Amino acid sequence: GAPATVTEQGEDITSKKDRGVLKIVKRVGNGEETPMIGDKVYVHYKGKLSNGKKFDSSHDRNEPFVFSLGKGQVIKAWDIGVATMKKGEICHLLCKPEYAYGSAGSLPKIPSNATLFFEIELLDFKGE
Numbered sequence: 001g002a003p004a005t006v007t008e009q010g011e012d013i014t015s016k017k018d019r020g021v022l023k024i025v026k027r028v029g030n031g032e033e034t035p036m037i038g039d040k041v042y043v044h045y046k047g048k049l050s051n052g053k054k055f056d057s058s059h060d061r062n063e064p065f066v067f068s069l070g071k072g073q074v075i076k077a078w079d080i081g082v083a084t085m086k087k088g089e090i091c092h093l094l095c096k097p098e099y100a101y102g103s104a105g106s107l108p109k110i111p112s113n114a115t116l117f118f119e120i121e122l123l124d125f126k127g128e
């Protein structure tokens, strides 16, 4: 399925080239511009664990998730991944634990040493 496909066919978007964050662009976005550091970014997403369980979805809340890019307000994989996206893009991101919740995990839903799969849609980005 989609997690296997990004695992096997995704692009390594890490600066270290350590395959910690792999990406496939699923829906091509608009033009060429990507957000810059400190922009307010608006995303919809869903996340799955490697046991197949959904652990989160903004769609199910009927509101986007909003954060300031490149400030560590989200896991490293998201700061790295969302920075590569165009407005209107949908991508898949496969996030090894070193770019996610590491050995700690995040109670109650994310175990230790968890590889995470996300589908992310970049709705908008704006400077403040």
Ligand SMILES: CC[C@H]1CN(CCOc2ccc(OC)c(OC)c2)C(=O)[C@@H]2CCC[C@H]1N2S(=O)(=O)c1cc(Cl)cc(Cl)c1
Binding pocket: 047, 055, 056, 065, 071, 072, 073, 074, 075, 076, 078, 100, 101, 106, 107, 109, 110
């Ligand atoms: C409010 C939901 C949000 C939680 N966060 C932000 C809080 O977790 C952080 C933030 C910054 C961090 O390092 C700079 C960090 O390192 C472990 C975790 C996420 O980064 C990631 C990515 C953005 C969407 C959500 N999570 S998530 O889906 O992995 C998630 C969902 C749920 Cl239901 C619980 C958890 Cl613990 C995480």
